[PDB]
Coordinates of C-alpha atoms in Angstrom, one line a residue:
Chain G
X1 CA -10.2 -8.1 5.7
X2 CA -7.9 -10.0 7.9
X3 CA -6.9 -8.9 11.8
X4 CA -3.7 -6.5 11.7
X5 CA 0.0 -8.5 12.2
X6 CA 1.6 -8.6 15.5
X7 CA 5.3 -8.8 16.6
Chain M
X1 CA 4.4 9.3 -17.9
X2 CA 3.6 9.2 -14.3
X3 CA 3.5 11.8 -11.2
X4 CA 4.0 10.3 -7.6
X5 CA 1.5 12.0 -5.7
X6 CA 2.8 10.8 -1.7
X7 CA 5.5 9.4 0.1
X8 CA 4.9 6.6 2.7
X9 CA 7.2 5.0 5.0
X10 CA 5.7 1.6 5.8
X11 CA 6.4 -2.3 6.3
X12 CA 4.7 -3.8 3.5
X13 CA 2.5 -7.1 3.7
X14 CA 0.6 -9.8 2.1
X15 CA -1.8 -11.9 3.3
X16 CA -0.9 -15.7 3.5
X17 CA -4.6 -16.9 3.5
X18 CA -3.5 -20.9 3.5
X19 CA -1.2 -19.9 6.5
X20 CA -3.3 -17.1 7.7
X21 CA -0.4 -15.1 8.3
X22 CA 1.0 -11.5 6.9
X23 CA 4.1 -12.1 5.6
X24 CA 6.6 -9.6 4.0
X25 CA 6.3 -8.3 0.5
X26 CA 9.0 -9.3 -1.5
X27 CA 10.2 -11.6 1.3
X28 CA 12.1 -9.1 2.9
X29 CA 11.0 -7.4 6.3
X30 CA 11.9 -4.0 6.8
X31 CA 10.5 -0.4 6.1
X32 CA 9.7 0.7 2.1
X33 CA 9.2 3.9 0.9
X34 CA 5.6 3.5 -0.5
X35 CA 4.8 6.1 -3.5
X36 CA 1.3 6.0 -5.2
X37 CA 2.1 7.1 -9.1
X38 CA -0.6 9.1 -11.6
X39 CA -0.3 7.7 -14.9
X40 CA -2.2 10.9 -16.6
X41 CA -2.6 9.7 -19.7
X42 CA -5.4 7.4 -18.4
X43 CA -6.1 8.9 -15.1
X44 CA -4.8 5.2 -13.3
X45 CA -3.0 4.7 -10.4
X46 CA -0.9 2.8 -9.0
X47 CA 1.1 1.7 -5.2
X48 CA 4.8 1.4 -5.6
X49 CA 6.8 0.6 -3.0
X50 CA 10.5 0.2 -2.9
X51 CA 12.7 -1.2 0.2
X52 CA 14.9 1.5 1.8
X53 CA 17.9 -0.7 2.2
X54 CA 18.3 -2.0 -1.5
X55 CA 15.5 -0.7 -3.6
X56 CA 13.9 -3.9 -4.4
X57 CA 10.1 -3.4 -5.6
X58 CA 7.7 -4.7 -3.3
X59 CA 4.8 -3.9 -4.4
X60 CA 3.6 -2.6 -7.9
X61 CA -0.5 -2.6 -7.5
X62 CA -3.2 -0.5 -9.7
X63 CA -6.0 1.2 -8.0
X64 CA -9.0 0.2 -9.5
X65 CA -12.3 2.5 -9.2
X66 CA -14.5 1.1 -6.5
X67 CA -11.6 -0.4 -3.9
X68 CA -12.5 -0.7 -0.2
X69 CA -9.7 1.2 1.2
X70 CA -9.6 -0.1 4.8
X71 CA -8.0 2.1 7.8
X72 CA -8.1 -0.9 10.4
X73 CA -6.3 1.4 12.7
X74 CA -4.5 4.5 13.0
X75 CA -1.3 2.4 11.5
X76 CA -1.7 -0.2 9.8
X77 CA -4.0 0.2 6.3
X78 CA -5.2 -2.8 3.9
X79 CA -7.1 -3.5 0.9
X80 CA -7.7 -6.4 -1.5
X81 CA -7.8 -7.3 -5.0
X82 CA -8.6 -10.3 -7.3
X83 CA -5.3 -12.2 -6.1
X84 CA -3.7 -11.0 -3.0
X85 CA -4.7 -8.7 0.4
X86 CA -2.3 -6.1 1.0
X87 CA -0.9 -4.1 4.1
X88 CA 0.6 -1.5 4.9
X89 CA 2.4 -1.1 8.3
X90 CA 3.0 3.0 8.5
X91 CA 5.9 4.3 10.2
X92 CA 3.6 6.7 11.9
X93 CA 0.6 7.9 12.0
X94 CA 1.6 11.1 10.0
X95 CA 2.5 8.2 7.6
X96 CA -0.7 7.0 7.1
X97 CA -2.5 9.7 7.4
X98 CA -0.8 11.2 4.1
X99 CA -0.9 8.1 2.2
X100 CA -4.7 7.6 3.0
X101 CA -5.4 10.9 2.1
X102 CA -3.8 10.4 -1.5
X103 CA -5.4 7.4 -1.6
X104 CA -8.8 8.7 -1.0
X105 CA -7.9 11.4 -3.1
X106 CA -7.3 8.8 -6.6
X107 CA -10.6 6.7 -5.2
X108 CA -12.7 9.9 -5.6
X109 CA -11.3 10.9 -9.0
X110 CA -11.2 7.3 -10.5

């Protein structure tokens, strides 16, 4: 699973 | 046909995995109102979210038996499927917590 988004 | 069984608020996303990069589903960023539907009939499931602003679908996705439901953190929830990875970007945490627990909820019943 990929890293959460950011801004 | 089909029974929502929760309401979401969330900033829906797909995975750009040759960009490595969320983007907006639909192509639009902004807040949806994320339902998951019971098609009884079948006992299947599916996400549907619809933008607040214009309604535009963006995202229709079944729930198959088996899915790794993954609560990254307390706001932001992902899963994948055969095609895309999808993410949901909750409002609040009373958000996800409601739309997890229907999603748990359809896992353990598929």
């Amino acid at each position: 699973x990929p890293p959460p988004p950011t801004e | 046909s089909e029974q929502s069984i929760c309401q979401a608020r969330a900033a829906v996303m797909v995975y750009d995995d040759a960009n490595k990069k969320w983007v907006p589903a639909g192509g639009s960023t902004g807040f949806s109102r994320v339902h998951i539907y019971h098609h009884t009939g079948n006992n299947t499931f599916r996400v549907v979210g619809r933008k607040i602003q214009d309604h535009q679908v963006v995202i229709n996705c079944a729930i198959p038996k088996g899915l790794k439901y993954n609560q990254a953190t307390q706001t932001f929830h992902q899963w994948r499927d055969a095609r895309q990875v999808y993410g949901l970007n909750f409002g609040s945490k009373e958000d996800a917590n409601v739309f997890a627990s229907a999603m748990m909820h359809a896992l353990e019943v598929l």
